[PDB]
Design a binder for this molecule. Structure first.
Ligand SMILES: CCCCCCCCCCCCCCCCCC(=O)OC[C@H](COP(=O)([O-])OCC(O)COP(=O)([O-])OC[C@@H](COC(=O)CCCCCCCCCCCCCCCCC)OC(=O)CCCCCCCCCCCCCCCCC)OC(=O)CCCCCCCCCCCCCCCCC
Ligand SMILES: CCCCCCCCCCCCCCCCCC(=O)OC[C@H](COP(=O)([O-])OCC(O)COP(=O)([O-])OC[C@@H](COC(=O)CCCCCCCCCCCCCCCCC)OC(=O)CCCCCCCCCCCCCCCCC)OC(=O)CCCCCCCCCCCCCCCCC
Ligand SMILES: CCCCCCCCCCCCCCCCCC(=O)OC[C@H](COP(=O)([O-])OCC(O)COP(=O)([O-])OC[C@@H](COC(=O)CCCCCCCCCCCCCCCCC)OC(=O)CCCCCCCCCCCCCCCCC)OC(=O)CCCCCCCCCCCCCCCCC
Ligand SMILES: CCCCCCCCCCCCCCCCCC(=O)OC[C@H](COP(=O)([O-])OCC[N+](C)(C)C)OC(=O)CCCCCCCCCCCCCCCCC
Ligand SMILES: CCCCCCCCCCCCO[C@@H]1O[C@H](CO)[C@@H](O[C@H]2O[C@H](CO)[C@@H](O)[C@H](O)[C@H]2O)[C@H](O)[C@H]1O
Ligand SMILES: CCCCCCCCCCCCO[C@@H]1O[C@H](CO)[C@@H](O[C@H]2O[C@H](CO)[C@@H](O)[C@H](O)[C@H]2O)[C@H](O)[C@H]1O
Ligand SMILES: CCCCCCCCCCCCO[C@@H]1O[C@H](CO)[C@@H](O[C@H]2O[C@H](CO)[C@@H](O)[C@H](O)[C@H]2O)[C@H](O)[C@H]1O
Ligand SMILES: CCCCCCCCCCCCO[C@@H]1O[C@H](CO)[C@@H](O[C@H]2O[C@H](CO)[C@@H](O)[C@H](O)[C@H]2O)[C@H](O)[C@H]1O
Lengths: 102, 167, 87, 55, 186, 77, 54, 80, 558
């Protein structure tokens, strides 16, 4: 919310806070009681940026699907780390073709 | 992924999935870190408009600029590929002399002036491009043109002359 | 989770203390080191420098309470000759 | 009042000016037009008040 | 016309008179002070030293030889301090719109328009960064209102003053169009 | 013996420079900072020593509408 | 947790103390004023309750 | 009651109580000037309270009219 | 101006070691506080729920300035206790303008006026109060969590130092030690609460927290449960600092141990700043829509504190025999009324809250002045009672027992009626001002559904009136155990007073006995101004109550 981050630049969740301040100030007044009800989803995104609960929930099911989807399929030839570490290198074209199965 | 500096990273996660065919492909820049610094002032002499347009498109569309600004980024990597291509076509010897200097000098520009001045000579003759640093003070010699560099580790020999465009 | 445990330690210093007015001095500072430590670890999580600064000012007020606290404890000892609590 | 009016509306001008990535800051001219209307309305009320009661 | 006269969000305060500036520069505050502002500051400033001398005569301190001279110096500094703060705070509330300011609205309109037609930046040129100018402005906006607790003064040439500057430009335009016809007439 | 500042201001300053030198010249140096702020900067602008422009600490985005470039397109690739 | 590099935000990176300094003396300088006064009170008060004057 | 009257008397009452608390004599001739001074301060404070009263009356008047717009304008928008 | 005052006074007291130079530094602290009143008085020409200043870390409000000036004047009245000698010598021969202005009186004043008394010798005492006042007027105007924390510590730390400044009393140093050790734990609670606020909201600004609470108050992944849990820990620390039961055991002990001069200041100033700050926090944390948020309202801790403070404060005070312990418990029963008005958040309760705080701060001040003046009065009296002989710090707290006030009506009748008028105001008997305060708090509670608490409050008000009447019965229903000093009136015992003129020539000599020694005018006049305000409020109520009605009209406006 402050606007100042660790590296001298701005804070990561400051855009969401201004998107939430702008919503409340330009949609809610004393004339209209429920205008602040457009700030609900905007406030959720701000709380998500700071804490990352819904993304954690999403990436915790998707990772449970993939890990048992790639646990039962047949494995032909797993590329070794040394092969991956030569990927995209100008004299190791053989390893890159193996990695990308082209 | 997040822009946070990592403290306990022990593994790398690579995704071999290719970009979709909908998005026009672009050959990527292949110059390493020191070749880029040697050609940095040349690139912004030519691609400044494309470099500034790309940064403006992103500013114009907040939170959505990695997407929706993809054509502009391809324009910048083509402008810079033409500078890197042009320098190799005419100044290859002077270019490699300067960037190999910067390799052993902490990539600090004031540490390789004799090599830079020769490259600036060849690029201005061959490509009519000129190193310009904007908003420099007016009451003194430009730092990139001074016969003496105070913070240089090795002294600049007096016969090594700074390249003034026209003398 | 370490921040909450270390907060308990400061609390429990107040639970087990019938005679040490010095451990009451100590546990207040353990409690301050929990709260500053919690602020700091959440600041790293949110990329905010204000959490770091708020820690700094907690550390400066914490030292000042030690000066006022040990100064008053000196004034008491001069006329008492004992920090003990008869019980 | 169930509505809060910011005592410091100048926090919309907050934020680091350094190491700013393109697109990071939001387009807040809808906000500045709110506050412009608020200043112009208040200038009008006093204008309409100490000029129609000064005659 | 810069096409944007209200460039920053500013706080509107409910007051009875027109706002000239959220954050007047120190010299403008001095320069607009009416001669009553000087009488009042001097009157308050002498009061703390004179209150202290009055107390010593009516209810003597019984202090030693040099003690009252020392106290007279301190009461005198506080009087010059409180006296100047009151004089400054009296002038600057006309800028804020919290005091009748008909005189200073005219003096403000003239000078600010005379600056526009001279090509001058409306609020002057700042050696500070646009970002440090915005920090300075947020610190000093309506700060004379906190003088009894904390002293602050504006010594920066920022362009954030809470007012829509279209009127100064509009009046410059209407004044330029008036002078041009006169020159064309003769 | 030792003078009094508010009776003899100049005479106290000589005694303090001679008898309390570290203390006296501390207040002197501390006052020179306030003076150097007041004096050199206007004299610098008199001799034409213009302050250097600030260095960029963010990407320098130019103001105004986008320029509508043409060049370096997908066909050129 | 996953992290990736950025270039526009890495132009002139500051150490945490320079980032604290960029704002500690300007934007949030009221916090410095109160702290200066808390330390100043802990000086005067603790000296006055312990020492015998003169 | 009259404010200038109440406050003038309040200052005269304050002098009588002070002498009673001190147990000093009320009405000695060389100190009778105190009653005029205490009364004059009571007069002055009260001329200041009359200015306070005048302004508060304008404010409470305005507010009771504002609450009578908010209640009115809301009823106007509820007629739809 | 408070900051320019501290620095200038600090520099002057830093280069002096003279203790005779304290009475004058306290006089300048009164003149210094007068310039602050001239500056905040002129900062009241606007309508706003608030203006954030100095980067949003501070705010200014009409309620903020009024309280800043009230704080400064309550401070100027306590400062008089250390700026004027306790007793004076008056003769009708030196009583006119020409005399008090152009003539002079010379006599041996040291033992009459207690020139080298303890309260006349600390040089930093005017400075320490000014650092407490600074923390109080900052707490009123704090817009950020850090600002709250830094202000509360500035005020708390200076209260501990004031409570330890009589360095040569075993009682005073004991009390400062109890205050710091229980006060430091209270600060952890205030720090824990603010930390848990920022760590869940990402913000330290109160207005952002108010808006996050505003958007939540609508009748899924991120419930805002933290706000009511954080503010309940947060209010626990502030409950301790104002000594509300259950966190009240510290006040009777600290208020009785420290010197009476000091307990005037410490037992008034901290409540005024803490209670004004809480009111704004209660208004913007309200749940307009009955949802699950209002079930965990932090305001319930204030409702339970008020209920417990009404009982504890009035029941435990029945068996006190020490007057300062009695007055400490009486203050706990008055915060049970202040806390109920705060807990019911209505337009009527806030107006009744504002009145109760100001008038109670004004009346308990009279109760402290009357006590200090009675202590100074017994200088010309002697006693043979064996119990008074064994009291401790008989110089720092001259009146310690309620039995030392037996037959004071016989010694000083109007001082006894001033203490009667003030105590009957604590009871809440009409036409006294303290009635009109409890009337408003009860009407606010009854109008909004707090009938159960009102019946409890009027029950304890009967119980609390028992120990107030014991003080009245003791001063008037009995004969004094204090007799006039026989030597002061010995016929042969007289002190010679010389009347001079402008050029120091004798105008007259006079022979004076102890009958010519009185209370000093600053104390007598201050007592009579407040006793008269309590007794004559029904004829002078429009400006005071109207100020409150306008102030709450803005806080609730729109
Ligand atoms: C809590 C308690 C707080 C108590 C104090 C309250 C302070 C209230 C706020 C004051 C501080 C903030 C303002 C200064 C910051 C700033 O950027 O200044 C803008 C100013 C120029 O900004 P700009 O954007 O060009 O604005 C137009 C200028 O007015 C045009 O500038 P210029 O061309 O006129 O510049 C020349 C000018 C430079 O001075 C200024 O312009 C501003 C400084 C005046 C402060 C006066 C004292 C405070 C009252 O020098 C002078 O005229 C002589 C004064 C120099 C300093 C003397 C020593 C002061 C302290 C003595 C003790 O910057 C400077 O010139 C840099 C020097 C500033 C040094 C200030 C040091 C203050 C230290 C006080 C210690 C106590
Ligand atoms: C930064 C803080 C720097 C403090 C060190 C300044 C030098 C110093 O200690 O002066 C006292 C030093 C000792 O002289 P002294 O005559 O032995 O002191 C005993 C007297 O009763 C003199 O007693 P006094 O109260 O009349 O004078 C003490 C005070 C002058 O205090 C006042 O008269 C009013 C207080 C001014 C406060 C200014 C705050 C800003 O002197 C200052 O600190 C002036 C600073 C400007 O010399 C001065 O009086 C220098 C005054 C210029
Ligand atoms: C809601 C509230 C609304 C209130 C409405 C008005 C109610 C009535 C208020 C009347 C205030 C009278 C103030 C002056 C006073 O005491 O007159 C008698 C006063 C003392 O006569 P005394 O009571 O027979 O005492 C005999 C000796 O002077 C021996 O006397 P001492 O040495 O024991 O002390 C003398 C002097 C000590 O104070 C001074 O020396 C006054 C310095 C003023 C600057 O005492 C006072 O003046 C105490 C005044 C306390 C006022 C604030 C209380 C709260 O007469 C004088 O000779 C004083 C000079 C004339 C007055 C000049 C200052 C006027 C403004 C003072 C503002 C404070
Ligand atoms: C019953 C208990 C009483 C205890 C003793 C105190 C009694 C008074 C209680 C508070 C009443 C309100 C006092 C507010 C401050 C003083 C304001 C006032 O009366 O005049 C304002 C005036 C304002 O004067 P001014 O010159 O600034 O006003 C300018 C505006 N015109 C010219 C239109 C009036 O007095 C002051 O200068 C204020 C500071 C006075 C010095 C300190 C006084 C403290 C009391
Ligand atoms: C027992 C209750 C204790 C309450 C304590 C607080 C009381 C506060 C009382 C003061 C209230 C404000 O009192 C106010 O002071 C200012 C001082 O410039 C003056 O007010 C004036 O201000 C400016 C001039 O400076 C004018 O433009 C304005 O029109 C006018 O109102 C008036 O004198 C009075 O309206
Ligand atoms: C403007 C002028 C510059 C400001 C002043 C510069 C600082 C000069 C030194 C400051 C102190 O200057 C002087 O120090 C000596 C220390 O023994 C002291 O001088 C005196 O101290 C005490 C009085 O308190 C005496 O008992 C002693 O005989 C005498 O030496 C005083 O503290 C001060 O008169
Ligand atoms: C024994 C008790 C005796 C009475 C003690 C209290 C008397 C003083 C109460 C004064 C406060 C109420 O009275 C009124 O309040 C409002 C709002 O705060 C303020 O009113 C102020 O703001 C408005 C709005 O811009 C200005 O136009 C006006 O000139 C100014 O006076 C003043 O303060 C005072 O005019
Ligand atoms: C038996 C012992 C004596 C008990 C009674 C003592 C006096 C009781 C007075 C009458 O009882 C009183 O009724 C009124 C009106 O019905 C209530 O006042 C009411 O105001 C609002 C008005 O919107 C009602 O919604 C709410 O039910 C209630 O608070 C009081 O809260 C209650 O105290």
């Amino acid at each position: 919310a402050s606007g100042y981050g660790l590296n001298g630049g701005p804070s990561r969740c400051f855009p969401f806070w201004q998107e939430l301040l702008a919503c409340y100030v330009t949609n809610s007044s004393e004339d209209n009681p429920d205008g602040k009800n457009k700030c609900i989803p905007v406030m959720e995104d701000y709380y998500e940026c700071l804490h990352h609960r819904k993304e954690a929930a999403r990436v915790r099911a998707l990772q449970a699907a993939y890990r048992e989807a790639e646990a039962k399929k047949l494995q032909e030839n797993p590329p070794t780390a040394g092969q991956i570490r030569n990927l995209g290198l100008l004299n190791k074209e053989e390893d890159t073709k193996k990695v990308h199965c082209a | 992924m997040a822009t946070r500096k990592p403290a306990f990273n022990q593994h790398v996660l690579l995704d071999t999935t290719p970009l979709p065919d909908s998005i026009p492909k672009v050959k990527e820049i292949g110059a390493s870190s020191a070749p880029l610094l040697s050609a940095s002032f040349f690139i912004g002499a030519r691609c400044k408009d494309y470099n500034d347009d790309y940064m403006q498109c992103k500013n114009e569309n907040p939170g959505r600029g990695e997407f929706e600004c993809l054509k502009e980024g391809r324009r910048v990597t083509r402008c810079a590929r033409s500078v890197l291509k042009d320098i190799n076509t005419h100044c290859l010897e002077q270019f490699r002399a300067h960037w190999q200097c910067l390799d052993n000098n902490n990539q600090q520009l004031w540490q390789c002036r004799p090599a830079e001045w020769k490259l600036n000579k060849c690029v201005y003759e061959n490509l009519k491009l000129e190193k310009v640093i904007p908003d420099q003070p007016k009451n003194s010699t430009p730092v990139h043109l001074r016969q003496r560099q105070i913070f240089a580790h090795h002294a600049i020999p007096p016969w090594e002359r700074p390249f003034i465009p026209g003398q | 989770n370490i921040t909450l445990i270390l907060f308990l330690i400061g609390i429990l210093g107040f639970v087990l203390n019938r005679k040490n007015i010095i451990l009451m001095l100590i546990s207040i500072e353990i409690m301050l080191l929990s709260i500053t430590f919690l602020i700091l670890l959440s600041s790293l999580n949110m990329d905010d420098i204000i959490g770091q600064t708020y820690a700094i000012y907690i550390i400066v007020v914490a030292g000042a309470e030690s000066a006022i606290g040990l100064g008053i404890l000196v004034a008491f000892y001069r006329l008492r000759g004992s920090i003990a609590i008869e019980y | 009042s169930r509505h809060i009016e910011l005592k410091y509306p100048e926090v919309f001008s907050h934020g680091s000016p350094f190491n700013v990535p393109a697109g990071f800051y939001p387009n807040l001219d809808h906000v500045i037009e709110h506050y412009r209307k608020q200043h112009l309305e208040e200038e009008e009320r006093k204008a309409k008040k100490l000029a129609a009661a000064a005659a | 016309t810069p096409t944007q006269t209200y460039q920053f969000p500013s706080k509107t305060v409910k007051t009875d008179y027109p706002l000239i500036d959220n954050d007047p520069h120190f010299t403008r505050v001095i320069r607009y002070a009416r001669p009553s502002d000087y009488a009042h500051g001097l009157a308050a400033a002498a009061a703390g030293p004179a209150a202290l001398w009055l107390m010593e005569r009516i209810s003597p301190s019984q202090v030693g030889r040099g003690g009252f001279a020392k106290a007279m110096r301190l009461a005198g500094f506080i009087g010059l301090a409180g006296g100047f703060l009151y004089f400054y705070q009296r002038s600057i509330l006309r800028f804020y719109g919290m005091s009748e300011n008909a005189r200073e609205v005219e003096m403000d309109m003239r000078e600010m328009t005379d600056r526009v037609k001279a090509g001058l930046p409306l609020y002057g040129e700042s050696r500070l960064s646009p970002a440090m100018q915005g920090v300075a402005a947020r610190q000093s906006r309506y700060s004379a209102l906190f003088f009894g607790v904390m002293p602050w003064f504006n010594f920066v040439n920022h362009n954030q003053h809470g007012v829509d500057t279209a009127k100064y430009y509009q009046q410059a335009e209407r004044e330029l169009e008036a002078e041009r016809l006169a020159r064309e007439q003769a | 013996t030792t003078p009094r500042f508010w009776s003899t201001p100049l005479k106290y300053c000589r005694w303090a420079a001679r008898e309390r030198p570290a203390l006296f010249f501390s207040v002197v140096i501390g006052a020179l900072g306030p003076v150097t702020l007041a004096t050199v900067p206007p004299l610098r602008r008199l001799i034409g020593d213009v302050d250097a422009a600030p260095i960029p600490l963010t990407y320098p985005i130019p103001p105004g509408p986008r320029k509508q470039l043409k060049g370096y397109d997908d066909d050129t690739e | 947790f996953i992290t990736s590099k950025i270039w526009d935000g890495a132009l002139a990176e500051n150490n945490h103390i320079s980032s604290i300094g960029n704002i500690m003396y300007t934007n949030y300088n009221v916090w410095l004023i109160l702290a200066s006064f808390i330390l100043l009170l802990a000086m005067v008060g603790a000296i006055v309750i312990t020492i015998k004057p003169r | 009651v009259n404010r200038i009257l109440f406050w003038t008397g309040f200052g005269l009452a304050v002098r009588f109580w002070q002498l009673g608390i001190e147990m000093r004599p009320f009405f000695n001739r060389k100190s009778l000037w105190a009653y005029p001074l205490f009364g004059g301060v009571g007069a002055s404070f009260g001329y200041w309270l009359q200015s306070i009263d005048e302004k508060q009356t304008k404010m409470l008047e305005e507010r009771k009219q504002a609450i009578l717009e908010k209640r009115a304008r809301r009823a106007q928008r509820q007629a739809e | 101006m408070i900051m320019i005052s501290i620095l200038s006074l600090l520099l002057s007291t830093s280069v002096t070691l003279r203790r005779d130079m304290s009475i004058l530094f306290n006089r300048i602290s009164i003149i210094a506080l007068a310039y602050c009143i001239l500056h905040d008085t002129m900062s009241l020409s606007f309508i706003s729920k608030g203006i954030g200043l100095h980067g949003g870390l501070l705010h200014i409000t009409n309620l903020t300035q009024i309280f800043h000036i009230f704080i400064f004047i309550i401070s100027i009245l306590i400062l008089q206790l250390t700026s004027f000698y306790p007793r004076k010598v008056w003769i009708p021969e030196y009583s006119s303008l020409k005399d008090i202005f152009f003539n002079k009186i010379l006599y041996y004043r040291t033992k009459i006026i207690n020139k080298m008394g303890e309260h006349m010798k600390i040089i930093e005492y005017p400075l320490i109060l000014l650092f407490v006042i600074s923390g109080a007027v900052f707490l009123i105007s704090t817009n950020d969590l850090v600002s709250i924390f830094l202000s509360i510590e500035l005020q708390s730390y200076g209260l501990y130092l004031l409570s330890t400044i009589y360095r040569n009393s075993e009682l005073s140093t004991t009390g400062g030690l109890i205050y710091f050790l229980l006060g430091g734990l209270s600060s952890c609670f205030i720090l824990l609460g603010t930390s848990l606020l920022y760590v869940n909201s990402g913000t330290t600004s109160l207005d952002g927290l108010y808006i996050l609470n505003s958007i939540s108050d609508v009748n899924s992944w991120y419930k805002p449960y933290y706000l009511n849990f954080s503010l309940l820990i947060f209010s626990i620390g502030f409950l301790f600092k104002v000594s509300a039961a259950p966190f009240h055991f510290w006040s009777p002990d600290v208020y009785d141990a420290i010197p009476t001069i000091v307990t005037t200041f410490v037992a008034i100033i901290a409540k005024i700043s803490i209670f004004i700050f809480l009111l704004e926090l209660v208004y913007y944390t309200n749940s307009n829509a009955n949802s699950y948020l209002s079930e965990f309202s932090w305001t319930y801790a204030l409702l339970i504190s008020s209920l417990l403070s009404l009982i504890i404060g009035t029941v435990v005070g029945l068996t006190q025999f020490r007057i300062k312990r009695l007055l400490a418990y009486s203050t706990i029963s008055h915060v049970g009324f202040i806390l109920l008005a705060l807990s019911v958040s209505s337009i009527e309760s806030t107006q009744a809250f504002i009145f109760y705080l100001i008038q109670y701060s004004i009346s308990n001040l009279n109760a402290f002045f009357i006590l200090i003046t009675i202590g100074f009065s017994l200088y010309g009296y002697v006693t043979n009672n064996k119990e008074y002989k064994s009291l401790l710090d008989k110089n720092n707290s001259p009146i310690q027992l309620i039995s030392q006030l037996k037959g004071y009506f016989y010694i000083n009748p109007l001082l006894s009626l001033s203490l009667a008028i003030t105590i009957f105001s604590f009871v809440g008997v009409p036409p006294l001002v303290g009635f009109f305060a409890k009337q408003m708090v009860l009407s606010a509670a009854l109008d909004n559904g707090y009938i159960f608490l009102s019946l409890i409050a009027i029950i304890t008000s009967v119980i609390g009136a028992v120990y107030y009447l014991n003080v009245i019965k003791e001063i008037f229903f009995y004969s004094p155990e204090h007799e006039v000093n026989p030597v002061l009136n010995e016929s042969d015992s007289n002190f010679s007073l010389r009347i001079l003129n402008e050029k120091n020539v004798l105008i007259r000599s006079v022979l004076l006995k102890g009958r010519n020694i009185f209370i000093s005018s600053p104390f007598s006049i201050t007592i009579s101004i407040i006793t008269n305000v309590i007794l004559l409020f029904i004829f002078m109520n429009k400006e005071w109550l109207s100020m409150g009605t306008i102030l709450v009209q803005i806080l609730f406006s729109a």
